């Protein structure tokens, strides 16, 4: 059980391992194979809801273990699941589940309006969402292992994202240049803790993985967030809403092992069919 | 000048780099290999740890060029070679076995290892270990019992050749004694566990040493 | 130099020598001698003006090093003096000058309206003021290796000095009761290092020696501060402007030493005479 | 006459003479002596009026040149005059009169409320005012050849020459941070002209000379704006309202000299007398 | 039962009433002495660091109560006192001497340690140090080479009487050779150290011996 | 190693420095010189361009002990001093002459260069021009028609011995033919321009050989 031994250095040490990797949003089976064979590093699972049920505003929660041992028995990849916001029991369950990741989300209806999962309680590493560097530095405080931008999950727009990139980049380049009598002041103002400051100033970046997830639909849209120094991207209704789900699984995968390569950018962008539909609804 | 590459399609790297880096010898150049242009300029290359059915797949692009570069650099130059992880499923002539997960197969190995290896046989991500091993080597690196980051690793259940060296073992008080842990076959070397998440840079040095080798060869 | 060693170890050892005290005022050697004759623990240096002068709304700065050179001669007991906040260089120049201990002062004009000195920077222990927790582990994590109230300076009210020690004291035993999931929350609300919070939490207490200051004017007055819980007092005006400061200042420190005997804090304060006029102008 | 031949390049040299140096404000021959008495690499004419006179609102104007001249005689030091923002004609007048360098001063009663003067049009260097980065570079731009900071003219309060400090500094080395894409939009955001950003950028600080001015009153605060970066210091009323001219004149030179020696600056700090009184009225 | 009180009018006690429940002694009970009621409560006294010259003026109250029967304590009832810093001064016979500082001041000092001591004649209070001591003296708690916190402390300039023992010395590459920081004299223990800043507990243990002593005799 | 100083207590300096690391001469270090310490790591010194009645006075601190220890490394350990523009005044047997601004004025120069100089006689500062100089030397440096930046400089009215050589001159259509911009003495070099603000570094890397040769004396 819990980290803060140099089992952290372990959760680190293991997360480092999906650097430049695509991970996948799958709701079934079938999904988890196109997933596997685009050549995902992991997958994470969703519940599955038909399009009648999607208009209505149901308490979105962790799914079912039996669900995700089913989809786990027939693939080899990484595993990954969704817990509510402070919800520490639902992650309690997925931990003796012996699951890969956990992903503490803000797509999940919230348990907890105040409180975070205190993840440092748990051997499973957690991946949570932020828009800036203060939120991104206090989940770390609270133990996530792993970051990714909130961006806007599901419109297929990549606006956010890009924006959530930028903002948490500048931050850090920055905070990197201010005198040692500043430091403090900025801590306060971000409302993050000195000692997290201190070394993603000593380490030049942030100190744990980052991923670009929300709203990535072509490849165009994952090499773009890779150029901007991203670690790696999720990938969710951009694939399997798009008119031919194993095309656009394996391009993107191509695309961001490749996203200096402009090359081969164009070369997986060709007869690439339509891409998901989308909303620009704000 | 000795160029070391390290395929970067995906894994863990900016580590192996970085502990390639750690190594502090002025003659070393780390490069990131993506294609096959950056593979031309290598003296050796490591393929490190990472999702496999992922860096095999990355290699698959324009009708497998880099895989049939990589079969020709280990097999045809008899370039030095150092799958870690993933790579040394990867480096493998037999691989156990692939379920569901084939597709091209048996053409997925670049070969190079003459063993049979067995995908992450321990439970799942939240039972990955460390350890300490033995070596069976004169080289100078390798000292005092050194640590690893058995994570998640992969399985040698066979060795298949008497040209195949057993470089390190350990014995673990739950996978029985005398588990291989490193292995060499020529200007292959391969090892199970994730050499860039301890602090020591033992097999760097010697994979380094094999490299320089291979030059004056 | 710089703490953070163990001559931190060292400052924190320093400054318990302090509890029980009573550290006083004074603007000239007569000042000095009386604090001394009256049982204090040290004596705070402070600029020499006129009622005239005090009309103005000049700049208040760091004392003329002389004149703290001139006053220490004179007296055994520990000198302190002001430095503007943010003003890293007053500090230097009075740490060159060997003083005991240095306030970094909201009652003389800042010199910096964001940044805080970097205390840790110097071997010579600071005192900061605060109004509440966050302020005070704040200035604790900036370096320094003491907090005082920040009352209201000079008004001879002590109305205010007692809301910031009831504040400060209702956050730390609350603090201490929260469990360990919602501590990070808290921490976040007040602005403050999650490290130095557990600190709070584990001591059951504030980290550092913590005195009243701002509108103490009577025996009575300081001992209140006393069963409230401080370390101790720093009295100004409350002597000086009084109708007979050496008795005023004998009778306050005998109150602080004696804080929960009514006996002597009412023996104390027969015939004292006029207590500062003072201000009830917020 | 006009600059961008390389008579500019030329400016520019003329003015990294100035670099660690203390330009002082004089009112007539007797404080010009003391300024080059104490070290001063230049003098800067004000107009010579009585207290009564201070209290009305009286237009302020550059001063007569024949007070100029009479003054520049009797000293062999840099002699600067001010002039009003955007009237030319007094400008045109003192470059016919030979002096060193002018200073488009905010000090002085506005001429035109919408355009600075422009600069280029004359051989004579110019110094402006400034508060931020944008505002800096759009007086570079109109052909200055020189920047200080605005302060807080006359109060002998340092407070806001700090804040004018930290703002321009932070701006800069964020601005040399930023990517090529987003340097455009900031350039924007300042309202100053993306040659003189991309400028700045490449320089890694200010394109021109930059003095800390206004509110300086001790050497502890003329210290301070030299360990923040700055090229040098402008001193007024803090010298010749302090109770010894000659002698504050002369350690705040030695100080300016000196900055980074504690030992130095407690030395020249030493039995100074009393500080220009000042005033905390914003 | 034993009862060791801790002057507390103003110093470090909390410390020393809690370095000597670190003891873990059933016997021994700690209590803070601040009036004669209190004092006649105690088998043994600490009078501990801080300021004398404000500890000193604590006891003048009520017309010097508190002090006379300090006085009586130590001289007349011949009970264990132990004055550390503050306290160590205001055992001594020669306090080094009070220029300004006077005031009934020839009373000043409770006595019983016939030394001459100077008030903290090191720098100001950034130049504390810290110390390792030697020790005359064959009781079981003085063990291998002890620690101190000799922090702006005073000096013994004179030992004034053959009846002054000393008891522990020191050696600094600052002030000499052969530096005096403990005496015993009687009933009288005086250290110029901070005994509760360092973890271990010698003194405490030496004084409770002292006054376990004191008891028997 | 040679270490070349510039004094720092004020004028134009971070381009002297900038200049000197121009020459790109791995052997040469550069540092800032305001004290006595700072001189004493010196092989060779530069007093740069700024006030005078500025220099001398920084120079005159703690009873002119920089000044003292100027004189003595000009004079009688005999080490290359080069004084531009201000410096060069404060090298002048004669300087011209200090109506007012006379204080321990006789003093006020460090010597080494017999010669009579005039503080700039130039107009004001709005008036100071640029020249292209002839040089008298076989040294590698000096080339083609070089350049200065003779800004309200100063005016060499009297060489006053054989041994100043006169190391550079210009010809101007305002101030006459011949007037002196360049002077040697011994170990004194000094120049009426600034070096430091145009592109090339002949004279920066004159003054590196001048240090170098009196190394290797």
């Given at each position: 059980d819990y980290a803060d031994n140099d089992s952290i250095l372990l959760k680190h040490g293991w997360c480092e391992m999906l650097k430049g990797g695509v991970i996948m949003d799958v709701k079934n089976v079938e999904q988890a194979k196109i997933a596997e064979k685009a050549g995902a590093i992991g997958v994470?699972?969703?519940?599955?809801?038909?399009?009648?049920?999607?208009?209505?505003?149901?308490?979105?929660?962790?799914?079912?273990?039996?669900?995700?041992?089913?989809?786990?028995?027939?693939?080899?990849?990484?595993?990954?699941?969704?817990?509510?916001?402070?919800?520490?029991?639902?992650?309690?369950?997925?931990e003796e589940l012996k699951v890969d990741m956990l992903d503490e989300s803000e797509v999940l209806t919230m348990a907890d309006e105040y409180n975070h999962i205190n993840k440092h309680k748990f051997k499973t590493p957690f991946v949570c969402g932020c828009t800036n560097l203060g939120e991104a530095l206090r989940r770390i405080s609270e133990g996530a292992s792993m970051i990714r931008t909130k961006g806007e999950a599901g419109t297929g727009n990549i606006i956010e994202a890009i924006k959530h990139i930028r903002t948490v980049n500048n931050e850090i380049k920055y905070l990197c240049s201010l005198d040692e009598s500043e430091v403090y002041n900025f801590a306060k103002k971000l409302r993050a803790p000195i000692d997290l400051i201190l070394l993603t100033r000593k380490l030049k970046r942030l100190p744990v993985v980052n991923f670009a997830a929300g709203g990535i639909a072509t490849p165009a849209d994952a090499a773009m967030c890779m150029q901007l120094g991203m670690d790696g991207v999720f990938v969710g209704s951009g694939i399997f809403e798009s008119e031919n789900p194993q095309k656009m699984a394996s391009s993107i995968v191509m695309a961001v092992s490749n996203f200096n390569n402009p090359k081969i950018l164009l070369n997986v962008s060709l007869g690439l069919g339509k891409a998901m539909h989308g909303n620009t609804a704000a | 000048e000795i160029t070391i590459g390290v395929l970067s399609l995906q894994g863990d790297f900016e580590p192996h780099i970085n502990h390639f880096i750690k190594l502090q010898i002025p003659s070393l150049n780390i490069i990131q290999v993506r294609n096959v242009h950056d593979l031309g300029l290598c003296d050796g290359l490591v393929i490190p740890g990472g999702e496999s059915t992922t860096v095999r797949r990355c290699c698959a692009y324009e009708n497998d060029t880099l895989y049939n570069a990589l079969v020709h650099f280990i097999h045809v130059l008899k370039k030095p070679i150092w799958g870690t992880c993933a790579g040394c499923i990867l480096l493998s002539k037999n691989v156990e076995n692939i379920k569901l997960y084939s597709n091209f197969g048996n053409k997925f190995s670049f070969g190079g290892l003459d063993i049979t290896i067995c995908r992450?046989?321990?439970?799942?991500?939240?039972?990955?270990?460390?350890?300490?091993?033995?070596?069976?080597?004169?080289?100078?690196?390798?000292?005092?019992?050194?640590?690893?980051?058995?994570?998640?690793?992969?399985?040698?259940?066979?060795?298949?050749?008497?040209?195949?060296?057993?470089?390190?073992?350990?014995?673990?008080?739950?996978?029985?004694?005398?588990?291989?842990?490193?292995?060499?076959?020529?200007?292959?070397?391969?090892?199970?566990?994730?050499?860039?998440?301890?602090?020591?840079?033992?097999?760097?040095?010697?994979?380094?040493?094999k490299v320089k080798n291979y030059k004056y060869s």
């Open positions: 994470m699972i969703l519940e599955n809801i038909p399009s009648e049920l999607r208009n209505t505003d149901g308490v979105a929660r962790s799914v079912d273990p039996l669900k995700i041992e089913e989809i786990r028995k027939c693939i080899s990849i990484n595993v990954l699941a969704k817990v509510r916001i402070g919800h520490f029991v639902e992650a309690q369950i997925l | 992450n046989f321990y439970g799942s991500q939240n039972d990955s270990f460390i350890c300490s091993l033995n070596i069976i080597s004169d080289s100078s690196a390798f000292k005092k019992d050194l640590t690893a980051a058995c994570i998640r690793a992969p399985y040698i259940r066979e060795i298949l050749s008497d040209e195949v060296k057993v470089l390190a073992t350990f014995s673990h008080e739950s996978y029985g004694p005398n588990i291989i842990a490193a292995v060499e076959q020529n200007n292959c070397l391969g090892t199970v566990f994730n050499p860039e998440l301890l602090p020591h840079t033992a097999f760097q040095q010697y994979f380094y040493e």
